[PDB]
Write a protein that binds this ligand. Structure first.
Ligand SMILES: [Ca+2]
Length: 355
């Protein structure tokens, strides 16, 4: 670690809960770095007693694709010394031919990290249901992917969820328009909502009907707290296979995008877009990489917003619910009050986890 990377951690450790929060995670890894960065910081947050990641249900793609994502997730948890995490593939959800193409994106970098098929399960949220029935304390639900399985969990176990879930924290989007009853509803444009829009609608609505507090972190929250390439270069620096996966995934993705834009293989985007997005022409990528200053970490910030100790340190969520209704909070650009502490905590946790 670095000195300032210690003081923020030291500071976080002041806010350790009495018991770690048992956590149910809904995730779609290996189409970008986001989800695996989250597993990485979760490792350190588990080490320091903020959470315990008991169950992970994986979505995005058809049944076999979800199993591949599940095997990848498993492989990462194994390499993070998190051997107890129970990973299962989610259930089928509606897919056009177009979605079947797009939802099947699976980075080559992840192929070699895949655990054996028998290391992961096929029965979705069943174990989560069984856990909800037998847990002595309330659990958190963290949603960093499409909402097919999170919604199914509420549909199947609404009785249990009402009594046994403390909150549902979601990397999603809020329609500026409330529904007929003034309930918050998902934005059709936010990636995790659009994966299965009807499941997202059903999750946002049913959480409020059941009185489960909802916390929605939207993409603009990540902008202030975006990290440089050194976040990635740093975690890979000691040869940790998860750190190396992450750095390679982020760098290769950005490289493919620059080169495709440049050659016009990706005609709808231009150099000007790339520069506004990642920085602040005819160049090769090794000349562009050092200029990159902004890399967004949506899913990790979402996990940070889900734990009371981390959230108090970084955010002031804005209430969105009608008076006396089931609570709904928004974390957007203005609600991230210590973005530089956020950036530092993210780096500290990630580095610590890979030691
Ligand atoms: Ca994700």
């Amino acid at each position: 670690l670095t000195p300032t990377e210690a003081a923020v951690l030291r500071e976080l450790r002041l806010h350790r809960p009495q018991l770690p929060l048992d956590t149910l995670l809904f995730t779609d890894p290996n189409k970008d770095p986001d989800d695996v960065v989250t597993y990485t910081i979760a490792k350190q947050l588990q080490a320091d007693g903020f959470l315990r990641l008991t169950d992970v249900v994986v979505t995005l793609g058809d049944a076999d694709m979800r199993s591949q994502r599940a095997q990848l997730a498993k492989g990462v948890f194994d390499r993070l010394a998190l051997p107890d995490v129970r990973v299962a593939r989610g259930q089928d959800y509606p897919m056009t031919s177009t979605q079947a193409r797009e939802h099947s994106k699976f980075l080559a970098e992840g192929a070699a990290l895949r655990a054996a098929p028998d290391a992961v399960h096929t029965d979705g949220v069943r174990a989560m249901c069984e856990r909800l029935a037998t847990s002595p304390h309330k659990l958190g639900m963290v949603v960093i992917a499409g909402m097919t399985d999170a919604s199914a969990l509420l549909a199947e176990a609404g009785d249990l969820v009402r009594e046994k879930v403390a909150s549902i924290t979601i990397m999603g989007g809020i329609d500026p328009a409330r529904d007929a009853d003034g309930l918050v509803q998902p934005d059709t444009r936010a990636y995790n909502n659009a994966t299965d829009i009807h499941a997202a609608r059903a999750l946002y609505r049913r959480a409020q009907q059941l009185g489960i507090p909802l916390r929605i972190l939207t993409k603009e929250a990540a902008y202030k707290a975006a990290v440089p390439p050194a976040f990635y270069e740093g975690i890979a620096r000691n040869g940790h296979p998860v750190g190396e996966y992450l750095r390679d995934v982020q760098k290769n993705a950005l490289k493919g995008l620059w080169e495709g834009i440049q050659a016009n293989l990706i005609p709808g985007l231009d150099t000007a877009w790339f520069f506004r997005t990642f920085v602040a022409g005819a160049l090769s990528f090794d000349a562009i990489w050092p200029q990159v200053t902004k890399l967004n970490l949506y899913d990790p910030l979402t996990l940070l917003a889900a734990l009371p100790g981390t959230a108090r340190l970084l955010f002031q969520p804005t209430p969105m619910h009608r008076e006396g209704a089931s609570p709904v909070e928004h974390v957007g650009h203005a609600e991230v009050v210590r973005p530089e502490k956020a950036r530092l905590l993210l780096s500290a946790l990630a580095k610590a986890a890979l030691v």
